[PDB]
Amino acid sequence: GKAFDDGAFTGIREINLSYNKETAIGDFQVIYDLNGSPFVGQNHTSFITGFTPVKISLDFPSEYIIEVSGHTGKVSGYVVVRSLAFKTNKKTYGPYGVTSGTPFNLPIENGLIVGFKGSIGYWLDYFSMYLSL
Amino acid sequence: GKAFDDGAFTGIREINLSYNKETAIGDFQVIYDLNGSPFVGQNHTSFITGFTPVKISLDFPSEYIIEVSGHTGKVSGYVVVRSLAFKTNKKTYGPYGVTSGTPFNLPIENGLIVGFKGSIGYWLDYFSMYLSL
Amino acid sequence: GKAFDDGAFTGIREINLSYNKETAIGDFQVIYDLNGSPFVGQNHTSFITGFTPVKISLDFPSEYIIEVSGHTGKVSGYVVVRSLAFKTNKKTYGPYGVTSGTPFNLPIENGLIVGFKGSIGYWLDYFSMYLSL
Amino acid sequence: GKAFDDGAFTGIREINLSYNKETAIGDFQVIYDLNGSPFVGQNHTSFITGFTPVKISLDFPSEYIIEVSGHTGKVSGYVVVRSLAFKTNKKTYGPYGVTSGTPFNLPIENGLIVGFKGSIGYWLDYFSMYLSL
Amino acid sequence: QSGKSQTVIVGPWGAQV
Amino acid sequence: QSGKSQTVIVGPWGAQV
Amino acid sequence: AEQSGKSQTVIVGPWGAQV
Amino acid sequence: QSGKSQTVIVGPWGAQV
Ligand SMILES: OC[C@H]1O[C@@H](O)[C@H](O)[C@@H](O)[C@H]1O
Ligand SMILES: OC[C@H]1O[C@@H](O)[C@H](O)[C@@H](O)[C@H]1O
Ligand SMILES: OC[C@H]1O[C@@H](O)[C@H](O)[C@@H](O)[C@H]1O
Ligand SMILES: OC[C@H]1O[C@@H](O)[C@H](O)[C@@H](O)[C@H]1O
């Protein structure tokens, strides 16, 4: 897939992703906070279409992510991110995609997610998160 | 169970835990690094015995943990930490315990584990990790 | 003066300031690094003119600030920042302004300056710096 | 002089230093906080005697240092720390020593001092401070 | 300001309380 | 906590308002 | 810091394909 | 990669070795 690295910011305002209930996560894009103003992250796009888009608009800064969870597993022979769910201090967004494969989950007891990096081909291949105080 | 919280330190020198291959993790204790000298953490103990102890002695500081993984699930009706594995840049320690239930894994791309907190009753109920640069 | 606060970024690429050799620091503006690309900070302007501009263009990321120093003192009855000097791992820039009054200096042994805040009226009234690893 | 480096901790409980009103700072020792319990730092002692001791007992954690200031200058040909003052959110301790030479001051707008390092011969040759959130 | 240093904490994994 | 990250800030040097 | 002019951040992951 | 935690350090004030 095509690697991406958004880097780190001061918080998260919006997550725009797409998914397919037969395969995995496709597109991924984040509107970050940067010192009190939105910073529009680059669109990271799947090589293919047919995905269902979802817009996660957070009530920043009162609302913030406290857990990210999902599944990884093989689609067409490739290990990919098949589902994502974002839990905030207000509600749960998701799961989006296919909740099959190996689960993972990252609860944050103290701190914030302030950035994403990863790779997308047909689907989201992998991702990592920037954490800070 | 009884809550514990070691707080944060400079690094990790040794982990002393115990486990039972039919139930879950029991006892948990850590020798931290504190500014270049060992700091012996409190021994956190299960309410019961019958566990097998293991000593995980790291070659600090050249050897450090890069991923923590394991399983959670029910034992006698209680959700507990059933197994733990510690991967360093040199080797893997474990898994210790019962490798069934819901897997979890925390790979660290940049940063260090510098403290543990959690709760132990009959078994390790839950745990969290302090992370820093 | 009019308060300003750029917030925090991932590094410094360029500082544009102005000074008067009879009074104090005037205008202040920074091009930051933000995750590998320039981010152009707002120009913070003195209420008056007559200043001499200087452009401090750093060889980012090989070159970075390791000490900031200067002087504070009264001009026309106001306590202001009278001089600034920026020492990097390569070169010293300044002093700019008037090197009279109370000296201050901030050497950085470990870490980076990644943001500025302050206030400017006729002159730079005060300033603070964001530090990180 | 003899270098010292206490490293980093959770906070500060007490500072025990000595000074001479004709020369400079002599002895320096700190009782740190380490995850809620005192940690007694090594006593860093002058090569000579004749100093006046002072004990700075902070009401940790509600009382903490918000500015450190002092003077540096030459004594018997050596550049040393001639005076120190510690301002907390409750009171000011000092200045102790000789208030002559080049002033310095470090106000902390956001963050905490959590460690000291430096060198002491006849007098405190230099010092640095560990800062964290 | 608490007067005590802060660090990132991840978790907990296990029972949720 | 808040949804906004924080960093160490040193200063201010100058007028103390 | 005392090496590069670029700030650092804790990063956790990756989850997914291990490359 | 050092295996040891790090912290911002400001200074030194005094002699410059
Ligand atoms: O996303 C799953 C896969 O998609 C393909 O298009 C790509 O060539 C592979 O490298 C992998 O990324
Ligand atoms: O560890 C499993 C359980 O152990 C029991 O002894 C305790 O009362 C429970 O609260 C729970 O901790
Ligand atoms: O810069 C020094 C002063 O400049 C004036 O123009 C302003 O009204 C004052 O508040 C102060 O900022
Ligand atoms: O403290 C001032 C000086 O004190 C002397 O005793 C020592 O030899 C010097 O290196 C310097 O430390």
Run of helices and strands of chain E: E
> How many domains in all of chain A?
1
Topology, number of strands of chain A: 11
Bin the strand percentage of chain E: 35-45%
The quaternary organization reads as heterooctamer
Question: Strand order across the biggest sheet of chain A?
Answer: 4-3-2-5
Shape of chain A: globular
In whole angstroms, how far apart are the ends of chain E?
26 Å
How many H/I helical runs of chain A?
A: 0
- Secondary-structure element order of chain A, as H and E? EEEEEEEEEEE
**Most extensive chain-chain interface:** A-G, 24 and 12 residues
CATH superfamily annotation of chain A: Jacalin-like lectin domain
Determine the fraction of residues in helical runs of chain E and give it as a percent range.
Answer: under 10%
Number of helices of chain E: 0
> For the terminal residues of chain A, how far apart are their CA atoms?
31 Å
DSSP helix fraction of chain A: under 10%
